[PDB]
Structure formats: C-alpha cells, structure tokens
Design an enzyme around this catalytic site. Structure first.
Site, mmCIF file in Angstrom:
data_model
loop_
_atom_site.group_PDB
_atom_site.id
_atom_site.type_symbol
_atom_site.label_atom_id
_atom_site.label_comp_id
_atom_site.label_asym_id
_atom_site.label_seq_id
_atom_site.Cartn_x
_atom_site.Cartn_y
_atom_site.Cartn_z
ATOM 1 N N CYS A 172 34.863 -8.655 10.500
ATOM 2 C CA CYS A 172 34.115 -8.420 11.736
ATOM 3 C C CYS A 172 33.117 -7.272 11.588
ATOM 4 O O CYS A 172 32.149 -7.382 10.833
ATOM 5 C CB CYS A 172 35.105 -8.130 12.868
ATOM 6 S SG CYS A 172 34.410 -8.179 14.515
ATOM 7 N N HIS A 227 30.511 -9.914 11.474
ATOM 8 C CA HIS A 227 30.379 -10.637 12.724
ATOM 9 C C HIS A 227 28.867 -10.740 12.921
ATOM 10 O O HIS A 227 28.128 -9.830 12.536
ATOM 11 C CB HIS A 227 30.967 -9.841 13.885
ATOM 12 C CG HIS A 227 30.863 -10.549 15.198
ATOM 13 N ND1 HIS A 227 31.859 -11.367 15.682
ATOM 14 C CD2 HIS A 227 29.844 -10.628 16.087
ATOM 15 C CE1 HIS A 227 31.460 -11.920 16.814
ATOM 16 N NE2 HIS A 227 30.241 -11.489 17.081
#
EC number: 3.1.2.-
Lengths: 187, 187
Positions: free
Chosen positions: B105, B125
C-alpha cells in the site's frame, strides 16, 4: 442516522475474519462496536494476533439493538460463541426483531447451536459443513457468500472481503458498497 | 529451522494489511514478531482496530536479523515508518545483508524515505504512486504484487493475501504456499 454493527469477539476467533469486516464496515460509515465475549480485556485470536475490543459484550449489549450482528469464524472462537448464553440471547432477539445476522467460516455453527434461522440456505468453511449440517436443519450452499433473507453467511478468510461488502450493501446500499470497494484494490 | 519475520506496527497502520500477512505467515510455520514502533503498548490502527504488539521494535531489533522485514501500509502508518530512524537502520541492515523487504500500500514510500532499493521496479496503492515516484528513483508497476529481487511490494488491502502468499513462497517455497492457500478459500 448511521447504521450500527455489533462484532462479537471471542478467544480463538479468526483475526482476518474479524478485522476485515470491522475495517470495511467502518470505511462504509457504519458505527462498529467490537465487543469482547469474555470481557473488556484483549482477545488472543486463532493465530495469536491480540485485539483490544471496544467494550465488553455485556456493556455493548445494553446499547440497544444493532442493524447487524457479526460472528467471525475460527474453530475455537466459534465454539466459544456457540457455548455462550449471552450470544444465544442476542441472536434470538436479533432474529425476532428481524435484524441481520452475519456469520463466516465456522461462525455459522453458532447459529445451529442457538437454533437460529433453521431452514435457511447457508454456507460455511468446507471443514465446518458436517457440523453445520448435523440434523439437516439448514440447506447447504457452496457459494462464497450466501444471503437468505436476514441470514448472511460466508466461507473463510478468503471470502472475508466479499462477506464484508455484502453486509455493507445490505445496510447502506449498492452505491456505497461500490464506493468503499474501489480503494481496496480487490479483483 | 523456521524462517523469521519482523512486522513493524505503527499508529495509523492499515489493520488488514497488518493482520493478513501476520496470520498467513504464521499458517506457513514462519515465526512472526509483531513489533510496535512506538513501544510495547497497543497500537491504534487506521480504522481504529487496536492491536497489541508482541514486543517493542527496540527489543525485537535486538533479536538478530530476520528473513523478511514487513512494512504494512496505511497513510499515517507509512508516514510514521518513514520518519523513524530506527526503521531506517533496520531496512539499511536488511538490504545490506541481502534480506527480503516487503511493503504494501503506502508502505513502500518508507523505502523511498530511507533510500532503500533505488532502481527497483515497485508498485504501491494507486494514491501513493506520486509520492513514491518523486525523483524517479524507482520504476512503477501496476502488478498486484511486484517482486524485484529482495524488494517485494504490493498495492492495497485487496492484494494483502497475494502479498502474504508471495512472502511465504519466497521464504518457504511454492509447495508450502499452496498448502497454506487451500484452506483460505481464496479465488
């Protein structure tokens, strides 16, 4: 107003099946209460992850009915839920008031233990099927997520996102579910 | 012997990105240590789930090198990791000793902050891409999981399982990864 969710956390609960729904529902604007079955102290999950509940089930229970009662899986956790009279009362009341009940993995066996939603089409983790089907009180399904009226069930850690998003759709609608889903980078 | 994994937990960490890898690696027989960045006290994650680390980073660090250092995502958590000198030292040492480093992420931005693995092909992400690419020190990828040598990265909550299983395969092999995967009821 915002919908409210009660997540019952017991020792041995599968931490992924607990955290994924809690996180996803909160992303959905749902007010979630992680209630410890044994009390207010930290809960040691199935793979030793230690989670601190927002409150005790006893106190959370006193906070009026919820739009959904969520039962995480995990064999030992499900057993604890199944042996709890407090849980029995909560599910009975939720079913009576026609409120949503969601259970995943071995969690659905708690429904059998407390005679909840007999006759419903349900799913569970493959290894919990026999226990769930003892007596033939439910009809089995291999769907990753199964929703029969107010009884929503799912299969395991790997179906946790689908399970959570199904709960979100049931409480806040398809538009919100789609909005919450996009940032997760799922399939 | 069993491989060992260090998971660095900071306030604001994405709880799903923390719990999924911890759980999956433990299912793989990997000895996992959830180390709290701030100390031994409970950590309040991005969606308010409270996790109790197995130890402090300071103490965990003193426990020799690990076969993998895992950095969960979550914007605030990644920022905390990026501002930590302790984290900088740990990653520098891991990279130096040619040990695996896994980040998911927003977690990979901690690698940029500590000048780790420059030149590597990485993913993050979607919303963390610009931060990660400031200066063009890495080459970007949209693969759900990206592994360039000893630098393994992933995209978000929804890629957590793939991320975890990739780490398992890297440490214990494809056979173990497949064995651990089956009971999860994933795709």
């Amino acid at each position: 107003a915002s919908k409210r969710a009660l997540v019952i956390l017991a020792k041995g609960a599968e931490e992924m099946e607990t955290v994924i729904p809690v996180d996803v529902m909160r992303r959905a604007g749902i007010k979630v209460t992680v209630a410890g079955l044994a009390g207010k102290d930290p809960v040691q999950c199935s793979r030793d992850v230690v989670i601190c509940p927002d409150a005790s089930l006893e106190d959370a229970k006193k906070e009026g009915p919820y739009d959904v009662v969520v039962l995480p899986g995990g064999n030992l956790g499900a057993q604890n839920l199944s042996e709890s009279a407090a849980v029995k009362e909560i599910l009975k009341e939720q079913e009576n008031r026609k409120g949503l009940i969601a259970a995943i993995c071995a969690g659905p066996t708690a429904l059998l233990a407390h005679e909840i939603g007999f006759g419903s089409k349900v799913t569970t983790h493959p290894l919990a099927k026999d226990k769930m089907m003892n007596g033939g009180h439910y009809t089995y399904s291999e769907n990753r997520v199964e929703k029969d009226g107010l009884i929503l069930t799912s299969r395991g850690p790997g179906t946790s996102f689908e399970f959570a998003l199904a709960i979100v759709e049931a409480l806040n609608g398809k538009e919100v579910a789609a909005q919450v889903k996009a940032p997760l980078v799922l399939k």
